[PDB]
Amino acid sequence: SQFGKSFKGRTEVTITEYRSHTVKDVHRSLLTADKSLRKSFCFRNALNQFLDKDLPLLPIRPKLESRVAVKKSKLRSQLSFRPGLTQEEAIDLYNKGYDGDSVSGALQDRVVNEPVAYSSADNDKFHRGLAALGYTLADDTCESGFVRAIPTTPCGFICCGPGSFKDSLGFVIKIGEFWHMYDGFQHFVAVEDAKFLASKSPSFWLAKRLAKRLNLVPKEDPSVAAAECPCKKVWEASFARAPTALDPFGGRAFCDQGWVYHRDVGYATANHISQETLFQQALSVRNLGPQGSANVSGSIHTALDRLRAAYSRGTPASRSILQGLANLITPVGENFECDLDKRKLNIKALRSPERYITIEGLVVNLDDVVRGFYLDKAKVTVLSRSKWMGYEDLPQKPPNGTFYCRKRKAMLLISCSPGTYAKKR
Amino acid sequence: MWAFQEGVCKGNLLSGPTSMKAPDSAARESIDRASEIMTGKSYNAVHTGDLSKLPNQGESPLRIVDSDLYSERSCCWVIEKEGRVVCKSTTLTRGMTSLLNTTKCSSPSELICKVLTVESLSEKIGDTSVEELLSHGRYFKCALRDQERGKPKSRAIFLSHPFFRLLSSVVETHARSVLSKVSAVYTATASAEQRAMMAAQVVESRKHVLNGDCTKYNEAIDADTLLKVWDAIGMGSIGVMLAYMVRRKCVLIKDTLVECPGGMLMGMFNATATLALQGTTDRFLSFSDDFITSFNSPAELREIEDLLFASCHNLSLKKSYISVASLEINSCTLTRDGDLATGLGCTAGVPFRGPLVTLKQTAAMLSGAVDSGVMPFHSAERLFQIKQQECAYRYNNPTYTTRNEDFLPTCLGGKTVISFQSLLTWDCHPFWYQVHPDGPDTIDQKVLSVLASKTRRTRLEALSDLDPLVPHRLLVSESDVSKIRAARQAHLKSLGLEQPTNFNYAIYKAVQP
Amino acid sequence: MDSRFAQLTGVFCDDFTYSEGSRRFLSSYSTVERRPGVPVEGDCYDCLKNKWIAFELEGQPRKFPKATVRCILNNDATYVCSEQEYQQICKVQFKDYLEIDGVVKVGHKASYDAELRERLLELPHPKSGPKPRIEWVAPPRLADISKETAELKRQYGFFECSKFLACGEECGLDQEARELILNEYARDREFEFRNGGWIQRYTVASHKPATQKILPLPASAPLARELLMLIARSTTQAGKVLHSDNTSILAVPVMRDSGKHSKRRPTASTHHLVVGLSKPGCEHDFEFDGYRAAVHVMHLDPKQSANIGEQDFVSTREIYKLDMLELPPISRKGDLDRASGLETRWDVILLLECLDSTRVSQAVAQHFNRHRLALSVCKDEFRKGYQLASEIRGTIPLSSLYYSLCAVRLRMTVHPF
RNA sequence: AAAUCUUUCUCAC
RNA sequence: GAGUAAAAUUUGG
RNA sequence: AUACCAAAUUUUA
RNA sequence: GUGAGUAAAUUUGG
Ligand SMILES: Nc1ccn([C@@H]2O[C@H](COP(=O)(O)NP(=O)(O)OP(=O)(O)O)[C@@H](O)[C@H]2O)c(=O)n1
Ligand SMILES: [Mg+2]
Ligand SMILES: [Mg+2]
Ligand SMILES: [Zn+2]
Ligand SMILES: [Zn+2]
Ligand SMILES: [Zn+2]
């Protein structure tokens, strides 16, 4: 009869309210932690318990061994994109007698950012507390070369350079109104009904990757089939490999709404978007359509409006850069008009004097891009007319940073530098 | 010693201040400051900036996040027993449930729709009306918050009514959405370090940086300003009701109700107050009372000052300053080129709270320090060894341990002084896994949690182990709970299983490849 | 899936059965009728035909899979559906007009909106207030910090001894003598003895603050860790002498004197009088059996004792040392003294910060960090950030603030920035 | 008595 | 006695 | 115009 | 306001 007391006057309550009412209470001790642990020898007995029974059952964790050379750098955000259980996998676990609440807690994809001031040559991600020592999360030569923007040794195939499709490589592409997935052995087709990705065999690995990229729930649908299908020809054809790290989904674009995947490479283990590679990434997908690879701070619609407003006044090169950024930030398949030629021009976005967009923590002034700053010429702002101790002299082609210039004897801050953003080398 | 640091140092090494004082003095001081501001003698609480360019959200469907309305945090519940008013502290869960019981409503969204669709303030919505809800929702209770470094006089905090919280959640959700749509550089969800990095990028085109703070922030945010912003973004009657309750708020101090017509009572509307400034200009990177704008000439500085004045963002002349080589926001200091300023910065010391929790917390603090450039790794190793020695001095008596195994910490009778690098790269005896920052809970944490649990009525039938796809906004009766539990138990028995086996995502994934 | 249709869905499934007893239509909004572990593709599910059903209004499509059957509720009272059976079921079941309420929007204008706006208009409004005139000037100089320290010293002065701070040094007595002196001092003070412990009884309070003066700095604090550990142990062990390797203390519970029926054991809120020993040579000297020592007291509340006892002196010192400029020798009153000053007094200052439960040195440190980072500040206002005497009360916090300001002054004197 | 509205235990009437 | 809001870690469900 | 829950812990306003 | 007693913090930290 506790229901009639907690919810007096009501017969129905939400699951949220009921669960919140079934939360166990914790009473804070008035003693210090030391005295609480001493009381009744609770900690002493617990230590005996742990050493006698719990400790032997503890599995042995592997020891971290892989290191790379690192150098001190700006404070950056290291982004880790941890995926959650898929919908079908959650159903399978729940129907197998596993805890429904724990499974529900593991259903959500998490993205976390950690401050770090240390960078490696290949922009590796580091284990917690070991960035200074260079312990990387990353552990066949083609597998290694597939994740690299610039593979050391081309193998004559798409993974490691320009070329056709190897056996270990699959691809997902969009033809007409269908998504064709080809592995070399099996060819499948998928469609988006309302919020599901309906396909013959959703358990297919390429189908799982497509479901994760489209933010849809896999679904089994026998009555899905296509009319025309060049999967064989494109599989046998050769495509240019853009120099770029793998996107957070673990794939690389090779054509308009087409992406290549490697079976043994799950998810990107290196920073996909960085200050030095952002514009190259934007240029790579200039005309490949939405990618959904780079997260934008704030509203995607507002960012697209700013991109369209800047795009309305710019040269072809700046226009291509802006379109590349729009493709980088737009999720795949969602209700977004990322193409900055059919999108409507917003007057309010023109009203503002400066057009800023923040992509993966990088703040870019689109007005500056229009007048050719991040790629053609750097920006110089004088900070003082006195020499500051501990600052290097101004190089001939300076990158971003604070320098002392003897030619005018002043401290200069360099931003939007091609020596930092273009880096043709 | 903080005075003789070569780099930046906040002085966080010791713990924050403690205080057993009654909250009456601080709450009375806050209310007095708000009243003084109302007279137009000390600071400006009259908003004159233009907010006509904010997008209208009035057409959006009214949706309430139920999870935001239930918690074990404290709240004020108001009872009118015999014409008097009694304010008592309860949990937000209990307060929300009492509110929903008084006005018979399945969910908070049903209550909000009913409140918005009546045709009179006297019309009953159960055992109450909109007039009574507004009367009760303006009552606040006072409390003291201590353990904040740099505040020897702890701060006054206020528990609010469940109905006030219900309306505040809606207006704050929409204020955050408008900030994400309108802010030049969105920061309402970024961390302090992310805000610092974005600010460093933003202010790199101007010579001077104004490291700015606002004083009397919550006392100078008036109900008129709140209503102005809410009308600008289109909150309609919800905004009007919330502004009315804010104007008529009363705080229970000791045993007397004290009127506070001014202010918003210590950060009740952070996003709305931020929008009050962000909606008038795009020249500031700010959230709440912290902005990092920049300028080139004294005329631009005067423009910045006027903009701050017009938005009721009174510049703190005690703490705000101008710099050219550094920039600081949210206590994070960077050089103009984006580097973290050399020094301890915000590094905080670890007090003694247990043999293994102390070591784990020290490891986490040192991992954070070394991941940034705060200190080199060998310094962290030396500090960890010193911490192990101090823990050995503190905890190596029979009242904590009776063991002598070699692999144990010296503070538990062992002879092992582990290296920081060896611990971090899982290169230790498994007993040390609990000390790794990413490792599992330590023995002390389990013991203390067990002690907290064993401190005691009648439990509702548990509604755990639900289908992971069932939305939590669906309704259940007592019979529904019983039937769902019975069906789940029958399905489990069909699988020959006891209580569902605990599901660890990491372990389960490790079985996949 | 929209809650608006929930009730409507329930009417559709009205005691309809199949397979001789089993319910035919299962509502997606019903927690009991839902099939666990099955994704939802419509408002309800027909088990006999294995088909999802959704209810839609005219020109209002809903986001459901195309395989889900749509029951369109036409503007004119009629229910169209591709399946005839569902058409008939809707026709019969929706016999009573079930009008679906419209979506309530956030900008909804209630009937009482104008009334509440008028009420708000009649209530008080703020007045404009004056625009401040801001002058940006260089940060404070050494003379300003010196003026602040001199003001504190003039207004409060100095005690004759270091009082409990002196307990950071050995009193030069053995454990037996220390225990004897502490117990005999407690006896001479007329403390109640009960159950082998000491209790300090009180009846009336003057309800005024104790006298505040600055403490002179002892030469060193070799016993800082021991003293802090003793204070930590005293949190629950009160009324009997506690011994460390080199010193001892006595924590006495302070409880009211009702006279016959009085508190006999401390509770969570009971305060402590901490009695410690230092070398003699002040007005607090106490002698017994030829043993002499200065006895110094400190009145603490439980939170203060817990906070003080938990601090780690050694680790804090090492962390500060990591990136510290050379510390100069200082005198008893925190003045630069090259000829006769001691560098160990800095340890003492650290100990003082550990003893201060208000940690005013943290506010001073934050303001000094701002000072060292600042190029320009507001005239006459930034200087008014070191005037923290009004925020604190008591000898310990006052001395902590004074020596924090002295540290700032010494930094500006010997390592200008 | 002190870092002073704090040092406020229980039971029955 | 400890509110509002943001980031992150572990544990539990 | 529009287009995960709690317990503990650290930091931040 | 009256009377009476003396579960919780001492057990057990050098
Ligand atoms: N624990 C906290 C800290 C801050 N806040 C909010 O942050 C504002 C500025 O906090 P502050 O301490 O800075 N005082 P404020 O009156 O601005 O004056 P000051 O700068 O000290 O001159 C407050 O008003 C609140 O809205 C809060 O709610 N809870
Ligand atoms: Mg600031
Ligand atoms: Mg402030
Ligand atoms: Zn290859
Ligand atoms: Zn195909
Ligand atoms: Zn003395």
Numbering used by the authors:
A (entry chain C): 2 to 140, 144 to 429
B (entry chain B): 1 to 456, 459 to 515
C (entry chain A): 1 to 417
Article excerpt on this structure:
Tilapia Lake Virus (TiLV), a recently discovered pathogen of tilapia fish, belongs to the Amnoonviridae family from the Articulavirales order. Here we show that segments 1–3 encode respectively the PB1, PB2 and PA-like subunits of an active heterotrimeric polymerase that maintains all domains found in the distantly related influenza polymerase, despite an unprecedented overall size reduction of 40%. Multiple high-resolution cryo-EM structures of TiLV polymerase in pre-initiation, initiation and active elongation states, show how it binds the vRNA and cRNA promoters and performs RNA synthesis, with both transcriptase and replicase configurations being characterised. Recombinant TiLV polymerase specifically binds the conserved 5′ and 3′ genome and anti-genome ends, with mode A and mode B promoter structures similar to other segmented negative strand RNA viruses.
To structurally characterize the early elongation state, TiLV polymerase was incubated with the 40-mer vRNA loop, the capped 13-mer primer ending in …CC-3′, ATP, UTP, Mg2+ and CpNHpp. This leads to elongation of the primer by eight nucleotides to become a 21-mer, before stalling at nucleotide G11 of the template. Two distinct elongation structures of TiLV polymerase were determined from the cryo-EM data at respectively 2.96 and 2.42 Å resolution. Both show the full-length TiLV polymerase with CpNHpp bound at the +1 position and a product-template duplex filling the active site cavity. Unusually, the product-template duplex comprises 11 base pairs (+1 to −10) where generally for viral polymerases a maximum of 10 base pairs is observed. This likely arises from the PB2 lid domain not yet having managed to completely clamp down and enforce strand separation compared to the late elongation structure presented below. The CpNHpp is bound in a non-catalytic configuration with only one magnesium ion. Although a capped primer was used to initiate the elongation reaction, the cap itself is not observed and the putative cap-binding site remains autoinhibited by PB2/R217. The higher resolution structure with the additionally bound 3′ ends mimics a later elongation state in which the outgoing template would have translocated into the 3′ end secondary site.
